[PDB]
Design an enzyme around this catalytic site. Structure first.
Site, short mmCIF file in Angstrom:
data_model
loop_
_atom_site.label_atom_id
_atom_site.label_comp_id
_atom_site.label_asym_id
_atom_site.label_seq_id
_atom_site.Cartn_x
_atom_site.Cartn_y
_atom_site.Cartn_z
N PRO B 1 0.83 -1.23 0.00
CA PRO B 1 0.00 0.00 0.00
C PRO B 1 0.84 1.24 0.00
O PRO B 1 1.86 1.26 0.67
CB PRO B 1 -0.77 -0.10 1.31
CG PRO B 1 -0.55 -1.51 1.80
CD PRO B 1 0.78 -1.94 1.29
N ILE B 64 -2.13 -3.33 -3.95
CA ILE B 64 -2.34 -4.56 -4.70
C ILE B 64 -3.39 -5.34 -3.95
O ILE B 64 -3.11 -5.90 -2.88
CB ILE B 64 -1.07 -5.38 -4.88
CG1 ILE B 64 -0.07 -4.55 -5.68
CG2 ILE B 64 -1.40 -6.70 -5.56
CD1 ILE B 64 1.33 -5.11 -5.78
#
Ligand SMILES: N#Cc1ccc(CNC=S)cc1
Ligand SMILES: N#Cc1ccc(CNC=S)cc1
Ligand SMILES: [Cl-]
Ligand SMILES: [Cl-]
Ligand SMILES: [Cl-]
Lengths: 114, 114, 114
Positions: B1, B64
């Site tokens: 992140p 992701i």
């Protein structure tokens, strides 16, 4: 192709010619004339990577096509390589977000590339 | 992140541990080790929100996976909350764009996460 | 809608009222109330376009809907027009990336727009 690097490395540590080097190398890697290549370097940022403020970078590469699994691995080798050599940033403290742009979603010269 | 905040709040108003606080809180919210978390804060920006230059922020969170309807509502509560408490920005003058990145489109350590 | 401009033009060359002009013109072009429009201008950047450091810009427009072929052409004409008139940047040295954001991926006021 447009490449942006945001880094906590200070401005004085960005060496002379880095914008041209990026431009030439991206030309080579993407197969595109360097007239079409934009680059942007943002030093002195307030950033952390893994909780640490040692040198790091958050980057993006937008391109109309030429984005995919193997090409992205190859760009990441090249770009981390340049950021390590020129800016002394360890490759494991670099993220590069790749974006495959539709031609209709890139504006230029009062129109788009569609 | 990776979380980026751009704000017209001045640098002196960003409190000393803010980058670590963001890192720990994001670690907790995403379930990801904090070693993988990048944060970037850009104060003193020339910005307006709704035509006004009162304190505001434009943010992004790239991850992701871990992006979706409920998760994004939860991140928005957490992040607006932090920006209100720490930077004194009203939640209604904050935008946070969420991006669910494919692993193949994130470069790191001379290769991607694919 | 959110519009960001990064440019190598110096801060002193950005005229008074440019943020409010951007806001009004985007309101008009998108059909969105100006209350919900964010604008962000980043001058003094270290940038090249086609290998040249003549004036240029890299921009983005994020919007929940209101993105598409003809609309993007129309936004490009307007925005390049403003950047030429106000910042003296040639339209052929501007890129504008358009993003059609899903409502669920935009955070605001402790929630999202889903
Ligand atoms: N075809 C095509 C094409 C590809 C890229 C660009 C802009 N250059 C980098 S994003 C412009 C046109
Ligand atoms: N799986 C997986 C995964 C997810 C995120 C990252 C990078 N960390 C934040 S974007 C790296 C790997
Ligand atoms: Cl505004
Ligand atoms: Cl993640
Ligand atoms: Cl260039």
């Amino acid at each position: 192709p447009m490449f942006i690097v945001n880094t906590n490395v200070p401005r004085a540590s960005v060496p002379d010619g880095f914008l041209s080097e990026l431009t030439q190398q991206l030309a080579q890697a993407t197969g595109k004339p360097p007239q079409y290549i934009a680059v942007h370097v943002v030093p002195d940022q307030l950033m952390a990577f893994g909780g640490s403020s040692e040198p790091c970078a958050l980057c993006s590469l937008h391109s109309i096509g030429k984005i995919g699994g193997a090409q992205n691995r190859s760009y990441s080798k090249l770009l981390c390589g340049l950021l390590a050599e020129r800016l002394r940033i360890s490759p494991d403290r670099v993220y590069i977000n790749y974006y495959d742009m539709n031609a209709a979603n890139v504006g230029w010269n009062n129109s788009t590339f569609a």
